[PDB]
Design a protein around this ligand. Structure first.
Ligand SMILES: N[C@@H](CCC(=O)O)C(=O)O
Length: 252
């Protein structure tokens, strides 16, 4: 049994190895290790196919279509989708998910020297603009919330000029660095930790908020869903996911 593994390029989960390679050996990262571990645990072969548009997956109501990893699963061009793929209500409606392999939250990436100390403070001003990944799961946290403060955040993000949204974590982090403190990036704590440790001019504002999960995406009612889930839980209970997380996210 061989599974086509849809993913996207983005460190530390999945990226092109520096060559002084062929097939799966071209790639490295957290998600690469985890599929190898699961492949050995659940006994299956696999082929990594990073998606063409390099998107996570969002619904475009203007066209009634999905993109990114989620799209490849809907069209059955892939049997497994993985990265920092956050479980959302919209995504779960069109594809299935395994048990999560990582729990996380949301927080604020900022340039050092900022006076803002919380999300409430960030939304209650407009000298420092802020945004998220376009169509990403962090956008969902604000756009779907009934919480007044989150509503205000969402409406401010929509109003900012220029466009407050970015295509990925890399552009988000790059924008905070280039902006010298006039732009803050709302992102997941996992990715925030990764970048803040590798960029000394950046820091986290306030506490983590929200309860989010990364899961392996599979087609609805796939017969290898449970097999993948039991495998993830095995690695977790052994303490291997703890080690794996430290390997790629440990340390200005
Ligand atoms: N993990 C998120 C992307 C990162 C973010 O939105 O902050 C997703 O699955 O859409």
């Amino acid at each position: 049994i061989r599974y086509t593994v849809a993913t996207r390029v983005g460190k530390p989960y999945f990226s092109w190895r520096e060559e002084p390679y062929e097939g799966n050996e071209r790639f490295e990262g957290y998600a690469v290790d985890l599929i190898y571990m699961l492949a050995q645990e659940c006994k299956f072969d696999f082929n990594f196919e990073p998606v063409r548009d390099n998107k996570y997956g969002s619904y475009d109501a203007n066209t009634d279509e999905w993109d990114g990893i989620i799209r490849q699963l809907i069209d059955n061009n892939a049997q497994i989708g993985i990265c920092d793929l956050t479980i959302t209500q919209a995504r779960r409606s069109v594809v299935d998910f395994t048990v999560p392999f990582m729990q996380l939250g949301i927080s604020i990436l900022s340039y050092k020297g900022t006076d803002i100390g919380s999300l409430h403070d960030l939304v209650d001003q407009n000298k420092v603009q802020f945004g998220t990944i376009r169509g990403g799961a962090t956008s969902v946290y604000f756009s779907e919330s009934n919480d007044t403060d989150n509503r205000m955040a969402w409406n401010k993000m929509l109003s900012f000029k220029p466009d407050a949204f970015t295509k990925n974590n890399e552009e988000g982090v790059d924008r905070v660095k280039l902006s010298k403190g006039t732009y803050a990036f709302l992102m997941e704590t996992t990715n925030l930790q990764y970048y803040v440790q590798r960029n000394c001019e950046l820091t986290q504002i306030g506490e983590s908020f929200g309860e989010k999960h990364y899961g392996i995406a599979v087609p609805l009612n796939a017969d290898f869903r449970s097999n993948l889930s039991v495998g993830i839980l095995r690695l977790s209970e052994r303490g291997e996911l703890f080690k794996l997380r430290n390997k790629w996210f440990n340390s200005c």
